[PDB]
């Protein structure tokens, strides 16, 4: 636990300063990108170990394929976008984990 | 040419936003900026200058969001100001510069609208240099086909979609090919009007519309390769305007890797320069910097004459990218992640 | 069954996850997410989280660290074994270990 906390601060503030580089060549996508929403990319499953005569619940990372923002920032902001949407990607597994 | 009738109509509204241009940050002032270790201190460092009492009247925890806001607060107070004191042939002009927004904001509308939510909750979040008279489109709301019947009937926006998209396409494209469709209808009639506009005007407005034109080739190109786009749907949001019109245009809408991409831009040495200055490595510039520096470079070439609307836009563009700047800066320092602070623009 | 993580947290925590895949609408067109807007009350945040452990969809929830000390009767105050809660650093808020409800139940932590 305390190990993933101290991997999982880092990461989250290299993607919460890659947002700033989104910000800076994209404008305000943020809006764009809260207001559409429909169906995830990413999602999970609970699961199982019954170690030592007792059930442990855990979680595994799953995706779907389907990007739901594939053409955003494509006039403008695309390669930043590209590296943001990567980051926050890395940081939910590690997240899953942590749960 | 431009002299018989310029001044007669223009000549205040050039002088004012020379005065404005004056009223810049110089790479003097960003190393100013720069140096300081909290926004306690941009703002007294801000403060020296045409920013001064831009956060006065407001909560003493400053954020890098408040900052942003009221950054464009002045950009914006601005603009409308010179275009409530423009006659109509510099009216019509600044008009044009408000379009590249107001169809951002029509995007937000038409998406939330496709989502079934109210317009009055879009309102706070549309750009101030786009907002419209005509409010019975956002009062309505009911239905995606009637905003676009209410945008025909209330928006200037209204002859854009006749060329390019009927009720039937908005109920079927993605609003980011919306986005840039209307966006090439767009830059295509006001480049067009800036060659109706002869001489002076059209001399520095070409090559920076000309230049977007290319713009928006290049990197809808490059991002396009991971996407369900096809050739044809490249080729139908590439603006005609460009260099490239002639072949290249085409050639990048054949294109599928960052090589054959540059292998266009080899036909231009401008462009080749662009390229060549940026691999997007790790601590290099990006290819998207790269484009963003060089629209300050062709910006700047705007107040090298004396009697053209290219004055307008360029400093519209100049003091967007004066935000964008002090916003990276402010990021920056904010986040203590000094390593690229460096990454501004020189403006001037 | 699969489940999703939902968030609560500010725009550009938020901005970030949607991007990073995370954002749904539940069959009755709720999201898995608020935006903490500046003018949000704490009614909304802590009502939000109470929706989201009680909900059957959501199996994780993520709590920007600053967020989750606003809510913290609430959020200390669930218990339930199964649905998890994340408090989460962002770049004007704390640090991931900042007041931490489980790290201070142990024994054997340094």
Redesign the interface.
Known sequence: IIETKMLMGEVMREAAFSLAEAKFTAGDFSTTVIQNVNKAQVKIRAKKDNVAGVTLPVFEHYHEGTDSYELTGLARGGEQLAKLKRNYAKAVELLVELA | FPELYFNVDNGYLEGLVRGLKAGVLSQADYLNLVQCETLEDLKLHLQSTDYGNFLANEASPLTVSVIDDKLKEKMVVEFRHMRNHAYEPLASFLDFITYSYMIDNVILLITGTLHQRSIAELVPKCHPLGSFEQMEAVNIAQTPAELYNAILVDTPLAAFFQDCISEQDLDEMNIEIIRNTLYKAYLESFYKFCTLLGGTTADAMCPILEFEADRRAFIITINSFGTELSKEDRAKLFPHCGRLYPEGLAQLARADDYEQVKNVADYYPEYKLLFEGAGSNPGDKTLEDRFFEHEVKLNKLAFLNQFHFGVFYAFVKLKEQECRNIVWIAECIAQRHRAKIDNYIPIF | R????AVIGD???????????????NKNRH??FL?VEKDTTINEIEDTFRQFLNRDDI??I?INQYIAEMVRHALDAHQR??P?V?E?????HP???AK?S??RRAKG?F
């Open positions: 699969g489940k999703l993580i725009e550009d925590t938020v901005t970030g996850f949607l991007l990073g895949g995370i954002g749904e609408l999201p898995n935006v199996g994780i993520l074994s199964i998890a994340l989460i650093p962002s770049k004007e640090y991931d270990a931490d489980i790290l932590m």
